[PDB]
Amino acid sequence: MAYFLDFDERALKEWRKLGSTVREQLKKKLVEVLESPRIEANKLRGMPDCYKIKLRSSGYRLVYQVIDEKVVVFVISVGKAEASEVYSEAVKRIL
């Protein structure tokens, strides 16, 4: 089963800002993750169905919500997560 992928406009700004190779790999991660977006190992616990994927390369993280309701995975934020600034979007967006 495959889900759809969507991006927030704030996430898009960061996505297009992101390094080509960095975003490419994150994009590929989104593409592979779609076979099973609800991976417990990527899941953020406490967050309804938000998941984070990190890059092996430069340490970029992407945080998305899997909207089972709409069968679409919506990227809320993308960038870096050591300052937890991407969670500030994620937590406020969920409502």
PDB file of all heavy atoms in Angstrom, residues 14-36:
ATOM      1  N   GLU A  14      12.142  25.710   3.231  1.00  0.00           N
ATOM      2  CA  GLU A  14      13.306  25.068   3.789  1.00  0.00           C
ATOM      3  C   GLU A  14      13.834  23.974   2.856  1.00  0.00           C
ATOM      4  O   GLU A  14      15.023  23.831   2.687  1.00  0.00           O
ATOM      5  CB  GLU A  14      12.980  24.496   5.156  1.00  0.00           C
ATOM      6  CG  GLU A  14      12.422  25.529   6.124  1.00  0.00           C
ATOM      7  CD  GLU A  14      13.325  26.732   6.292  1.00  0.00           C
ATOM      8  OE1 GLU A  14      14.541  26.566   6.538  1.00  0.00           O
ATOM      9  OE2 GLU A  14      12.851  27.873   6.132  1.00  0.00           O
ATOM     10  N   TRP A  15      12.927  23.248   2.239  1.00  0.00           N
ATOM     11  CA  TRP A  15      13.237  22.164   1.306  1.00  0.00           C
ATOM     12  C   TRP A  15      14.033  22.682   0.112  1.00  0.00           C
ATOM     13  O   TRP A  15      15.034  22.103  -0.282  1.00  0.00           O
ATOM     14  CB  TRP A  15      11.915  21.543   0.825  1.00  0.00           C
ATOM     15  CG  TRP A  15      12.043  20.427  -0.161  1.00  0.00           C
ATOM     16  CD1 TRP A  15      12.005  20.526  -1.519  1.00  0.00           C
ATOM     17  CD2 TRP A  15      12.204  19.046   0.133  1.00  0.00           C
ATOM     18  NE1 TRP A  15      12.136  19.290  -2.082  1.00  0.00           N
ATOM     19  CE2 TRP A  15      12.260  18.364  -1.091  1.00  0.00           C
ATOM     20  CE3 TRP A  15      12.311  18.318   1.315  1.00  0.00           C
ATOM     21  CZ2 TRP A  15      12.411  16.995  -1.168  1.00  0.00           C
ATOM     22  CZ3 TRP A  15      12.463  16.955   1.235  1.00  0.00           C
ATOM     23  CH2 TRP A  15      12.513  16.308   0.005  1.00  0.00           C
ATOM     24  N   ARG A  16      13.579  23.777  -0.450  1.00  0.00           N
ATOM     25  CA  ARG A  16      14.234  24.381  -1.600  1.00  0.00           C
ATOM     26  C   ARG A  16      15.518  25.097  -1.191  1.00  0.00           C
ATOM     27  O   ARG A  16      16.408  25.337  -2.021  1.00  0.00           O
ATOM     28  CB  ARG A  16      13.271  25.309  -2.322  1.00  0.00           C
ATOM     29  CG  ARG A  16      12.089  24.569  -2.920  1.00  0.00           C
ATOM     30  CD  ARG A  16      11.094  25.515  -3.533  1.00  0.00           C
ATOM     31  NE  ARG A  16       9.977  24.810  -4.168  1.00  0.00           N
ATOM     32  CZ  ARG A  16       8.920  25.409  -4.728  1.00  0.00           C
ATOM     33  NH1 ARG A  16       8.798  26.735  -4.668  1.00  0.00           N
ATOM     34  NH2 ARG A  16       7.993  24.679  -5.346  1.00  0.00           N
ATOM     35  N   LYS A  17      15.597  25.431   0.081  1.00  0.00           N
ATOM     36  CA  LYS A  17      16.776  26.046   0.681  1.00  0.00           C
ATOM     37  C   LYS A  17      17.839  24.982   0.913  1.00  0.00           C
ATOM     38  O   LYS A  17      19.031  25.241   0.797  1.00  0.00           O
ATOM     39  CB  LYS A  17      16.380  26.652   2.024  1.00  0.00           C
ATOM     40  CG  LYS A  17      17.500  27.318   2.810  1.00  0.00           C
ATOM     41  CD  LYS A  17      17.035  27.691   4.213  1.00  0.00           C
ATOM     42  CE  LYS A  17      15.831  28.612   4.174  1.00  0.00           C
ATOM     43  NZ  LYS A  17      15.367  28.978   5.521  1.00  0.00           N
ATOM     44  N   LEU A  18      17.373  23.793   1.245  1.00  0.00           N
ATOM     45  CA  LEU A  18      18.209  22.653   1.550  1.00  0.00           C
ATOM     46  C   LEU A  18      19.142  22.307   0.406  1.00  0.00           C
ATOM     47  O   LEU A  18      18.824  22.538  -0.775  1.00  0.00           O
ATOM     48  CB  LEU A  18      17.350  21.429   1.874  1.00  0.00           C
ATOM     49  CG  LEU A  18      17.436  20.866   3.294  1.00  0.00           C
ATOM     50  CD1 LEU A  18      16.988  21.880   4.326  1.00  0.00           C
ATOM     51  CD2 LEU A  18      16.603  19.614   3.390  1.00  0.00           C
ATOM     52  N   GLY A  19      20.279  21.751   0.763  1.00  0.00           N
ATOM     53  CA  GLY A  19      21.251  21.327  -0.202  1.00  0.00           C
ATOM     54  C   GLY A  19      20.664  20.295  -1.123  1.00  0.00           C
ATOM     55  O   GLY A  19      19.906  19.429  -0.674  1.00  0.00           O
ATOM     56  N   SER A  20      21.000  20.386  -2.390  1.00  0.00           N
ATOM     57  CA  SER A  20      20.463  19.538  -3.440  1.00  0.00           C
ATOM     58  C   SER A  20      20.546  18.044  -3.076  1.00  0.00           C
ATOM     59  O   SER A  20      19.541  17.350  -3.059  1.00  0.00           O
ATOM     60  CB  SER A  20      21.231  19.826  -4.725  1.00  0.00           C
ATOM     61  OG  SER A  20      21.278  21.237  -4.968  1.00  0.00           O
ATOM     62  N   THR A  21      21.720  17.608  -2.703  1.00  0.00           N
ATOM     63  CA  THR A  21      21.979  16.220  -2.373  1.00  0.00           C
ATOM     64  C   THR A  21      21.262  15.820  -1.067  1.00  0.00           C
ATOM     65  O   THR A  21      20.842  14.664  -0.890  1.00  0.00           O
ATOM     66  CB  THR A  21      23.499  16.006  -2.236  1.00  0.00           C
ATOM     67  OG1 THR A  21      24.154  16.526  -3.418  1.00  0.00           O
ATOM     68  CG2 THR A  21      23.838  14.531  -2.098  1.00  0.00           C
ATOM     69  N   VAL A  22      21.093  16.787  -0.186  1.00  0.00           N
ATOM     70  CA  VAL A  22      20.453  16.562   1.089  1.00  0.00           C
ATOM     71  C   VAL A  22      18.956  16.358   0.878  1.00  0.00           C
ATOM     72  O   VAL A  22      18.377  15.363   1.327  1.00  0.00           O
ATOM     73  CB  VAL A  22      20.681  17.792   2.013  1.00  0.00           C
ATOM     74  CG1 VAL A  22      19.962  17.646   3.336  1.00  0.00           C
ATOM     75  CG2 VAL A  22      22.163  18.018   2.244  1.00  0.00           C
ATOM     76  N   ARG A  23      18.353  17.251   0.125  1.00  0.00           N
ATOM     77  CA  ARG A  23      16.945  17.153  -0.151  1.00  0.00           C
ATOM     78  C   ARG A  23      16.624  15.972  -1.039  1.00  0.00           C
ATOM     79  O   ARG A  23      15.573  15.365  -0.900  1.00  0.00           O
ATOM     80  CB  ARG A  23      16.329  18.440  -0.670  1.00  0.00           C
ATOM     81  CG  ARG A  23      16.989  19.047  -1.884  1.00  0.00           C
ATOM     82  CD  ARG A  23      16.005  19.956  -2.561  1.00  0.00           C
ATOM     83  NE  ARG A  23      16.570  20.704  -3.694  1.00  0.00           N
ATOM     84  CZ  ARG A  23      15.828  21.429  -4.551  1.00  0.00           C
ATOM     85  NH1 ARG A  23      14.502  21.411  -4.461  1.00  0.00           N
ATOM     86  NH2 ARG A  23      16.409  22.152  -5.505  1.00  0.00           N
ATOM     87  N   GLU A  24      17.516  15.663  -1.972  1.00  0.00           N
ATOM     88  CA  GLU A  24      17.366  14.491  -2.819  1.00  0.00           C
ATOM     89  C   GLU A  24      17.255  13.231  -1.999  1.00  0.00           C
ATOM     90  O   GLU A  24      16.348  12.444  -2.208  1.00  0.00           O
ATOM     91  CB  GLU A  24      18.512  14.378  -3.819  1.00  0.00           C
ATOM     92  CG  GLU A  24      18.327  15.234  -5.062  1.00  0.00           C
ATOM     93  CD  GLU A  24      17.163  14.787  -5.929  1.00  0.00           C
ATOM     94  OE1 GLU A  24      16.005  15.232  -5.690  1.00  0.00           O
ATOM     95  OE2 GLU A  24      17.382  13.990  -6.874  1.00  0.00           O
ATOM     96  N   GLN A  25      18.125  13.074  -1.028  1.00  0.00           N
ATOM     97  CA  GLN A  25      18.111  11.883  -0.208  1.00  0.00           C
ATOM     98  C   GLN A  25      16.904  11.843   0.707  1.00  0.00           C
ATOM     99  O   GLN A  25      16.319  10.785   0.910  1.00  0.00           O
ATOM    100  CB  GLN A  25      19.413  11.718   0.543  1.00  0.00           C
ATOM    101  CG  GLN A  25      20.568  11.373  -0.370  1.00  0.00           C
ATOM    102  CD  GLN A  25      21.884  11.366   0.341  1.00  0.00           C
ATOM    103  OE1 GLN A  25      22.324  10.341   0.877  1.00  0.00           O
ATOM    104  NE2 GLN A  25      22.519  12.494   0.350  1.00  0.00           N
ATOM    105  N   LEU A  26      16.506  12.996   1.223  1.00  0.00           N
ATOM    106  CA  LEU A  26      15.296  13.083   2.031  1.00  0.00           C
ATOM    107  C   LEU A  26      14.076  12.737   1.194  1.00  0.00           C
ATOM    108  O   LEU A  26      13.193  12.019   1.647  1.00  0.00           O
ATOM    109  CB  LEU A  26      15.138  14.466   2.654  1.00  0.00           C
ATOM    110  CG  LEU A  26      16.123  14.816   3.779  1.00  0.00           C
ATOM    111  CD1 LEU A  26      15.930  16.244   4.222  1.00  0.00           C
ATOM    112  CD2 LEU A  26      15.937  13.878   4.966  1.00  0.00           C
ATOM    113  N   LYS A  27      14.055  13.230  -0.039  1.00  0.00           N
ATOM    114  CA  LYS A  27      12.986  12.928  -0.976  1.00  0.00           C
ATOM    115  C   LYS A  27      12.910  11.426  -1.233  1.00  0.00           C
ATOM    116  O   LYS A  27      11.834  10.842  -1.228  1.00  0.00           O
ATOM    117  CB  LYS A  27      13.253  13.633  -2.294  1.00  0.00           C
ATOM    118  CG  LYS A  27      12.153  13.450  -3.318  1.00  0.00           C
ATOM    119  CD  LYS A  27      12.568  13.959  -4.678  1.00  0.00           C
ATOM    120  CE  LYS A  27      13.546  13.002  -5.346  1.00  0.00           C
ATOM    121  NZ  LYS A  27      14.084  13.551  -6.606  1.00  0.00           N
ATOM    122  N   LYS A  28      14.063  10.814  -1.430  1.00  0.00           N
ATOM    123  CA  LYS A  28      14.151   9.375  -1.666  1.00  0.00           C
ATOM    124  C   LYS A  28      13.674   8.605  -0.449  1.00  0.00           C
ATOM    125  O   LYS A  28      13.067   7.537  -0.582  1.00  0.00           O
ATOM    126  CB  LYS A  28      15.572   8.971  -2.022  1.00  0.00           C
ATOM    127  CG  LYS A  28      16.105   9.660  -3.258  1.00  0.00           C
ATOM    128  CD  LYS A  28      17.549   9.311  -3.494  1.00  0.00           C
ATOM    129  CE  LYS A  28      18.140  10.146  -4.602  1.00  0.00           C
ATOM    130  NZ  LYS A  28      19.539   9.784  -4.868  1.00  0.00           N
ATOM    131  N   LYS A  29      13.959   9.144   0.731  1.00  0.00           N
ATOM    132  CA  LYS A  29      13.484   8.579   1.972  1.00  0.00           C
ATOM    133  C   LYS A  29      11.988   8.625   2.063  1.00  0.00           C
ATOM    134  O   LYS A  29      11.369   7.679   2.528  1.00  0.00           O
ATOM    135  CB  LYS A  29      14.140   9.225   3.192  1.00  0.00           C
ATOM    136  CG  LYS A  29      15.604   8.860   3.379  1.00  0.00           C
ATOM    137  CD  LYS A  29      15.741   7.368   3.575  1.00  0.00           C
ATOM    138  CE  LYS A  29      17.167   6.938   3.780  1.00  0.00           C
ATOM    139  NZ  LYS A  29      17.255   5.481   3.992  1.00  0.00           N
ATOM    140  N   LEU A  30      11.419   9.707   1.608  1.00  0.00           N
ATOM    141  CA  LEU A  30       9.984   9.850   1.556  1.00  0.00           C
ATOM    142  C   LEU A  30       9.404   8.818   0.603  1.00  0.00           C
ATOM    143  O   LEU A  30       8.412   8.165   0.904  1.00  0.00           O
ATOM    144  CB  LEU A  30       9.610  11.255   1.094  1.00  0.00           C
ATOM    145  CG  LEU A  30      10.116  12.394   1.968  1.00  0.00           C
ATOM    146  CD1 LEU A  30       9.724  13.731   1.382  1.00  0.00           C
ATOM    147  CD2 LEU A  30       9.603  12.246   3.392  1.00  0.00           C
ATOM    148  N   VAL A  31      10.064   8.653  -0.528  1.00  0.00           N
ATOM    149  CA  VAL A  31       9.636   7.706  -1.535  1.00  0.00           C
ATOM    150  C   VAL A  31       9.689   6.253  -1.009  1.00  0.00           C
ATOM    151  O   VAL A  31       8.725   5.494  -1.175  1.00  0.00           O
ATOM    152  CB  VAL A  31      10.501   7.858  -2.831  1.00  0.00           C
ATOM    153  CG1 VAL A  31      10.185   6.774  -3.845  1.00  0.00           C
ATOM    154  CG2 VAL A  31      10.269   9.224  -3.449  1.00  0.00           C
ATOM    155  N   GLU A  32      10.778   5.881  -0.350  1.00  0.00           N
ATOM    156  CA  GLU A  32      10.888   4.540   0.211  1.00  0.00           C
ATOM    157  C   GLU A  32       9.950   4.324   1.398  1.00  0.00           C
ATOM    158  O   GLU A  32       9.327   3.279   1.514  1.00  0.00           O
ATOM    159  CB  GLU A  32      12.340   4.147   0.544  1.00  0.00           C
ATOM    160  CG  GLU A  32      13.038   5.074   1.509  1.00  0.00           C
ATOM    161  CD  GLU A  32      14.450   4.655   1.833  1.00  0.00           C
ATOM    162  OE1 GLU A  32      15.329   4.761   0.959  1.00  0.00           O
ATOM    163  OE2 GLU A  32      14.712   4.231   2.984  1.00  0.00           O
ATOM    164  N   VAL A  33       9.816   5.344   2.243  1.00  0.00           N
ATOM    165  CA  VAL A  33       9.006   5.247   3.444  1.00  0.00           C
ATOM    166  C   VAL A  33       7.532   5.001   3.116  1.00  0.00           C
ATOM    167  O   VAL A  33       6.844   4.374   3.866  1.00  0.00           O
ATOM    168  CB  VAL A  33       9.192   6.435   4.443  1.00  0.00           C
ATOM    169  CG1 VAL A  33       8.377   7.668   4.077  1.00  0.00           C
ATOM    170  CG2 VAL A  33       8.930   5.985   5.871  1.00  0.00           C
ATOM    171  N   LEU A  34       7.076   5.497   1.964  1.00  0.00           N
ATOM    172  CA  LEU A  34       5.677   5.356   1.519  1.00  0.00           C
ATOM    173  C   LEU A  34       5.165   3.907   1.511  1.00  0.00           C
ATOM    174  O   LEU A  34       3.951   3.699   1.580  1.00  0.00           O
ATOM    175  CB  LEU A  34       5.454   6.001   0.143  1.00  0.00           C
ATOM    176  CG  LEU A  34       5.538   7.530   0.086  1.00  0.00           C
ATOM    177  CD1 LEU A  34       5.379   8.024  -1.340  1.00  0.00           C
ATOM    178  CD2 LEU A  34       4.477   8.158   0.983  1.00  0.00           C
ATOM    179  N   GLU A  35       6.066   2.913   1.399  1.00  0.00           N
ATOM    180  CA  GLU A  35       5.643   1.501   1.440  1.00  0.00           C
ATOM    181  C   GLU A  35       5.083   1.139   2.836  1.00  0.00           C
ATOM    182  O   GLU A  35       4.253   0.240   2.976  1.00  0.00           O
ATOM    183  CB  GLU A  35       6.793   0.540   1.083  1.00  0.00           C
ATOM    184  CG  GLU A  35       7.952   0.546   2.070  1.00  0.00           C
ATOM    185  CD  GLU A  35       8.965  -0.529   1.792  1.00  0.00           C
ATOM    186  OE1 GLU A  35       8.767  -1.677   2.251  1.00  0.00           O
ATOM    187  OE2 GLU A  35       9.985  -0.259   1.134  1.00  0.00           O
ATOM    188  N   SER A  36       5.547   1.836   3.845  1.00  0.00           N
ATOM    189  CA  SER A  36       5.122   1.638   5.201  1.00  0.00           C
ATOM    190  C   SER A  36       5.476   2.908   5.973  1.00  0.00           C
ATOM    191  O   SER A  36       6.500   2.981   6.605  1.00  0.00           O
ATOM    192  CB  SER A  36       5.820   0.390   5.813  1.00  0.00           C
ATOM    193  OG  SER A  36       5.247  -0.001   7.070  1.00  0.00           O
TER     194      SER A  36
END
